[PDB]
Amino acid sequence: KKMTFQTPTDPLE
Amino acid sequence: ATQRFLIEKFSQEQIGENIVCRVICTTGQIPIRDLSADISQVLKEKRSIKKVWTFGRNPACDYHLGNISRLSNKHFQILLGEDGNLLLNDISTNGTWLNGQKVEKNSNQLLSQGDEITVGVGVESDILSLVIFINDKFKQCLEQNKVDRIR
């Protein structure tokens, strides 16, 4: 599965 | 006659049997749909809210989009009630946008005429816009908000 980001939360940085 | 009726069907009787608001994607991604609420239920039920629509990539959602990771199952939700107006409730994991202006999630906002909601913000190439069309016919009935008890 690794990391199937169902919905990315925008990696703000 | 069906040939002409098919064309005439567009101009003839205007749609709005009990339609609240119509969602139309201008960016060309999601198929147009018609949101509606029963007047009797709204006029009879004078509570906090009447009927609310949930939009997103979820097949449950009152609105089924295409398939954008930037969007959540239920990216946004629309509520109908109060009195004779409409409210827009964002419910996305990343956020819901209004004409380029990001609004507060799970927050109620006063609907706008032909308003537009943008979603999937983060990448200029990963944003999707949506246009909301308010039914003039519906507003007419709600505008009066009077029980048609006249025989």
Swiss-Prot record, chain A:
It comes from the Eukaryota. It is found in: Nucleus. Present with 400 molecules/cell in log phase SD medium. Physically associates with RAD53. Essential for cell cycle arrest at the G2 stage following DNA damage by X-irradiation or inactivation of DNA ligase. This is DNA repair protein RAD9. It comes from Saccharomyces cerevisiae (strain ATCC 204508 / S288c). The gene is RAD9. The chain holds residues 149 to 161 of 1309 of the full protein.
UniProtKB/Swiss-Prot annotation, chain B:
Autophosphorylated. Phosphorylated in response to DNA double-strand breaks; dephosphorylation is mediated by PTC2 and PTC3. The modification Phosphoserine is found at residue 11. It comes from the Eukaryota. The gene is RAD53. This is Serine/threonine-protein kinase RAD53. FHA domains are phosphothreonine recognition modules, FHA 1 strongly selects for Asp at position +3 relative to phosphothreonine, whereas FHA 2 selects for Ile in this position. Residues 53-103 form the FHA domain. Interacts (via domain FHA 1) with PTC2 (when phosphorylated); the interaction is direct and serves to regulate DNA damage checkpoint signaling. Interacts with PIN4. It is found in: Nucleus. Controls S-phase checkpoint as well as G1 and G2 DNA damage checkpoints. Phosphorylates proteins on serine, threonine, and tyrosine. Prevents entry into anaphase and mitotic exit after DNA damage via regulation of the Polo kinase CDC5. Seems to be involved in the phosphorylation of RPH1. Present with 6900 molecules/cell in log phase SD medium. Belongs to the protein kinase superfamily. CAMK Ser/Thr protein kinase family. CHEK2 subfamily.
